[PDB]
Amino acid sequence: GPALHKVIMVGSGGVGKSALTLQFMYDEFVEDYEPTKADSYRKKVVLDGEEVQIDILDTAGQEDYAAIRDNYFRSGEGFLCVFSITDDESFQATQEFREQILRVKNDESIPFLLVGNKNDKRKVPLSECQLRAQQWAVPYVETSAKTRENVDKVFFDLMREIRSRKTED
Amino acid sequence: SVSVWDEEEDGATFTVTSRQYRPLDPLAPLPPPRSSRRLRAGTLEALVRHLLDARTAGADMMFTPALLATHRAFTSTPALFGLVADRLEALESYPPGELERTTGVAISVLSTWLASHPEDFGSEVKGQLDRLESFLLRTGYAGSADLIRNLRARPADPTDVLVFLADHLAEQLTLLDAELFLNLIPSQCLGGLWGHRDRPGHSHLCPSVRATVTQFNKVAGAVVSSVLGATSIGEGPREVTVRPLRPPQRARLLEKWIRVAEECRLLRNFSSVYAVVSALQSSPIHRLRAAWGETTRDSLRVFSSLCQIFSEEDNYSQSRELLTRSGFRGGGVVPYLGTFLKDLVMLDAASKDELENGYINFDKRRKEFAILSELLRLQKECRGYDLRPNSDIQQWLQGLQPLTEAQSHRVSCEVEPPG
């Protein structure tokens, strides 16, 4: 049947997680975004010649709520852990969100991507950040907020990750 | 058929749209095409000229309420009041007919502004209020006097949940949620304010929104705390006192909160419904398979039905749509605020505040207002509640200490170890 990939995005409220979802789902017509519609976070996309739908669940604005994410993660098929390179607080919270989704899943090799967003005031280095992703046995991709670089990469690489998981039985 | 084109003025861009409709009587002349002339973008000064134009009410109908509800994202209340006064005093040398027109509009605008956003007016606007007061006395303008009057005028056992009737519990939680939702200042929910909450220097930003979230978290905490035999002592992951509880006893606590949640659903306190439901779906409670096993099927059906209501499926369509024994129980509503905060943060990132020329992108403000406007009317609905504090349930609620996530994960593993 028709495949549907469900990806969850985590990070602290200020990493511009919203900017990543909008830039991916909407290209030249980002202005025509309606936040209330049922279609709002669903895109019919061609992944590797295969026709497939994607759903993106973003905790934008809802980061202070206590229990709600537990059900977002359970069950979401894909996971994108986003941090801002310029700050230390959001990169430190990566550890909190990492165990948080594992506290809901018993899967070490669950589809995952560690990503840095937003260089003039970059406090973090690409050496100390890579020393956390590959230690979690997970690929690392550097993204830019407004330039539209590695935007499609992170949503396509993760969709393949769950395509690989859906095959495994 | 619709004709649409753009026009420009002083320091603003306008889009004019004219929609011709077919007549009532199929043989009658064409009705005059519905005209619409909306400000698209402009400088602050131009917005105020458009706000104090007599045509605006009838043409660009949503401009006035949109501007008043969203102006704190690109201005301050004192300044906007200042510009209205700036433009009025500038029309003192004008022909006396045009001054009388604009003054009338100014009164109208400022009345509506005071009526729908009263917390905008305080000590900060004293000078602007004096200027208007003096303006009205100089110009000989003859409710004018009404407007001036109204402007001047500005440790609890978590297991004791069982000891109270669920409908009473729901009433009591609604009371706390209703007052906080009434105290909500919608402009604080704007993406450009709420989205920047975590930035250093923004710790006291949006206090009315935070209180809404804190109350949500107490309820979620209450549920989690209550289902576990758990009472929090300190911040430490081992600083918890646990009541011993058999699985059928723990099931009764689960069924208790399910009934509470259902009663909140009856009262249309959707915020608390989602707090209870989330807590019962959270990892340290979802793990308790033995406890859920002792739960009545009737209770599980209700619970499943409550969960479907607040699913993320199709952009929360099921919870978004719901908004659109007892004596004299007034009708109210308390929405889950998160969904609104998500929309506004998302909407904040979809548009730049300013255009390349430096104009205020009012397009963004209209979209923001579509959400702000909706929760403004839900506040009006929320006033239809009529409930009274029950001091014992209240007292039980305040002495209630939520666990940390590390405390709840640890306890869950103690009371029901993994097989």
Side-chain angles (χ1 to χ4, degrees), chain A residues 1-27 29-87 89-118 120 125 129 132-141 143-152 154-169, chain B:
Chain A
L4 174 65
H5 306 330
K6 296 170 180 168
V7 38
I8 321 297
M9 285 178 64
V10 274
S12 295
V15 182
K17 304 183 282 89
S18 40
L20 277 152
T21 310
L22 293 164
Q23 196 56 46
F24 170 75
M25 197 149 291
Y26 305 85
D27 211 341
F29 15 86
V30 62
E31 297 281 57
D32 264 297
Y33 164 74
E34 278 88 54
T36 63
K37 286 180 177 174
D39 296 31
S40 208
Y41 303 106
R42 280 202 175 174
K43 194 179 181 175
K44 195 192 170 201
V45 143
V46 179
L47 167 78
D48 308 325
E50 185 188 357
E51 196 60 70
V52 53
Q53 268 216 59
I54 186 178
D55 187 275
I56 305 170
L57 187 54
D58 192 357
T59 53
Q62 307 177 76
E63 306 90 352
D64 301 346
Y65 291 110
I68 68 161
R69 71 198 63 219
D70 288 36
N71 192 69
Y72 289 22
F73 309 146
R74 189 231 332 275
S75 35
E77 293 147 1
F79 296 97
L80 296 170
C81 206
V82 202
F83 73 93
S84 177
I85 60 157
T86 185
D87 279 294
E89 198 184 337
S90 293
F91 176 74
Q92 210 153 7
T94 312
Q95 203 166 298
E96 188 188 35
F97 300 131
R98 173 77 199 188
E99 182 58 59
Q100 209 169 44
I101 79 148
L102 291 165
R103 204 157 284 184
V104 200
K105 305 275 201 180
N106 274 347
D107 205 308
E108 295 290 334
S109 59
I110 199 142
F112 198 89
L113 260 156
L114 223 190
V115 288
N117 205 28
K118 296 281 184 168
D120 59 299
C129 289
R132 191 167 281 186
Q134 65 185 38
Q135 275 84 335
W136 286 338
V138 162
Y140 176 82
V141 184
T143 50
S144 191
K146 301 271 107 278
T147 73
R148 212 191 199 277
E149 196 194 335
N150 282 116
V151 170
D152 273 29
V154 298
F155 289 99
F156 276 87
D157 288 328
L158 199 78
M159 277 174 85
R160 289 156 189 154
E161 270 258 28
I162 94 130
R163 187 267 166 192
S164 172
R165 203 78 195 178
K166 276 186 173 173
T167 312
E168 286 179 358
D169 293 305
Chain B
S1 59
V2 57
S3 184
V4 56
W5 73 95
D6 292 58
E7 281 162 13
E8 281 188 292
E9 277 183 341
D10 205 320
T13 300
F14 300 82
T15 283
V16 201
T17 156
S18 184
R19 45 193 93 182
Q20 251 289 348
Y21 288 91
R22 236 86 200 190
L24 288 150
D25 188 277
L27 306 161
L30 299 179
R34 273 82 148 173
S35 169
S36 167
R37 193 188 170 267
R38 330 201 106 105
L39 191 140
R40 265 268 175 172
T43 62
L44 200 49
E45 298 93 302
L47 294 171
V48 185
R49 297 181 209 120
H50 189 61
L51 185 81
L52 298 182
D53 189 342
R55 310 153 143 208
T56 304
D60 197 351
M61 309 184 78
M62 294 292 95
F63 179 83
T64 302
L67 185 272
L68 303 166
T70 61
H71 74 271
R72 281 171 175 256
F74 57 89
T75 327
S76 56
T77 285
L80 196 280
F81 199 143
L83 294 174
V84 165
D86 280 1
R87 221 223 162 174
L88 280 165
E89 287 164 342
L91 296 152
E92 283 190 56
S93 52
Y94 274 67
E98 211 167 322
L99 166 69
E100 195 187 317
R101 290 190 76 87
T102 310
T103 301
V105 180
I107 303 300
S108 186
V109 168
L110 298 168
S111 285
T112 303
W113 187 9
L114 181 64
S116 62
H117 313 280
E119 282 96 344
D120 278 355
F121 300 89
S123 311
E124 337 82 37
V125 225
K126 182 190 193 159
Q128 291 79 2
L129 175 59
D130 293 334
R131 283 176 60 194
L132 170 64
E133 205 168 294
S134 57
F135 168 78
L136 292 175
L137 286 155
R138 203 193 333 174
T139 193
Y141 195 77
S144 167
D146 196 32
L147 179 68
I148 299 305
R149 166 189 293 275
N150 296 320
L151 282 173
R152 280 179 175 184
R154 288 280 162 183
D157 195 333
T159 270
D160 274 350
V161 69
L162 298 163
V163 93
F164 305 114
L165 292 176
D167 51 303
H168 291 197
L169 275 154
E171 283 177 71
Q172 227 33 234
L173 291 173
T174 308
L175 183 86
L176 295 174
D177 282 328
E179 67 161 313
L180 292 172
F181 182 64
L182 287 186
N183 290 352
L184 175 68
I185 296 143
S187 61
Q188 291 179 8
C189 303
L190 284 168
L193 312 190
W194 178 248
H196 301 232
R197 93 191 89 105
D198 294 315
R199 284 188 186 180
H202 305 62
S203 61
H204 302 126
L205 225 75
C206 321
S208 66
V209 181
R210 289 199 179 178
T212 276
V213 174
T214 300
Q215 190 51 35
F216 187 96
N217 286 2
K218 282 189 169 176
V219 177
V223 180
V224 167
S225 184
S226 193
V227 165
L228 307 173
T231 317
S232 189
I233 310 158
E235 270 76 11
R238 298 203 167 197
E239 295 178 61
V240 174
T241 55
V242 174
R243 257 218 206 181
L245 295 170
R246 278 172 276 101
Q249 297 181 279
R250 181 170 265 106
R252 305 316 169 243
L253 286 153
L254 294 173
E255 295 161 355
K256 192 70 180 188
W257 284 112
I258 291 168
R259 184 75 92 265
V260 175
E262 171 65 344
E263 294 292 331
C264 284
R265 187 201 131 262
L266 292 166
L267 284 158
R268 309 175 76 251
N269 181 6
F270 300 110
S271 187
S272 275
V273 170
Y274 195 42
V276 176
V277 163
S278 298
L280 296 170
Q281 271 185 315
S282 72
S283 63
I285 304 304
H286 195 268
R287 278 213 335 105
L288 313 163
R289 286 294 98 191
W292 286 109
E294 297 306 313
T295 304
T296 321
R297 59 205 151 204
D298 291 348
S299 290
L300 287 170
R301 264 185 291 259
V302 167
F303 176 61
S304 274
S305 183
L306 297 165
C307 288
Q308 292 290 63
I309 294 312
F310 281 88
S311 80
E312 335 82 18
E313 288 302 83
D314 312 76
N315 191 24
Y316 302 81
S317 55
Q318 284 175 82
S319 71
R320 287 188 185 274
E321 200 91 339
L322 285 180
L323 304 166
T324 302
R325 183 223 275 156
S326 303
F328 266 91
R329 223 188 203 186
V333 70
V334 188
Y336 167 64
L337 193 67
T339 307
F340 294 86
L341 300 162
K342 192 192 76 193
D343 295 342
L344 289 160
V345 151
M346 212 65 71
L347 217 47
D348 184 50
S351 310
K352 286 165 195 165
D353 297 336
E354 311 88 21
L355 292 185
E356 282 166 299
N357 57 9
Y359 281 15
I360 289 154
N361 178 28
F362 204 83
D363 284 308
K364 189 181 188 185
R365 308 305 175 191
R366 287 184 198 270
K367 286 161 181 179
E368 285 181 329
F369 173 72
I371 287 136
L372 293 188
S373 165
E374 235 232 330
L375 68 69
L376 278 165
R377 65 143 193 100
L378 289 169
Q379 271 178 334
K380 291 157 213 152
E381 186 177 3
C382 191
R383 297 192 179 90
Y385 276 130
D386 192 8
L387 317 168
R388 294 291 156 97
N390 176 292
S391 66
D392 313 72
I393 303 173
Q394 283 307 307
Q395 182 184 25
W396 175 75
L397 258 323
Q398 24 236 35
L400 215 50
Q401 282 165 59
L403 310 179
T404 68
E405 230 143 35
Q407 283 168 333
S408 70
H409 173 256
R410 200 212 173 210
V411 165
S412 187
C413 284
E414 288 173 331
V415 302
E416 279 190 43

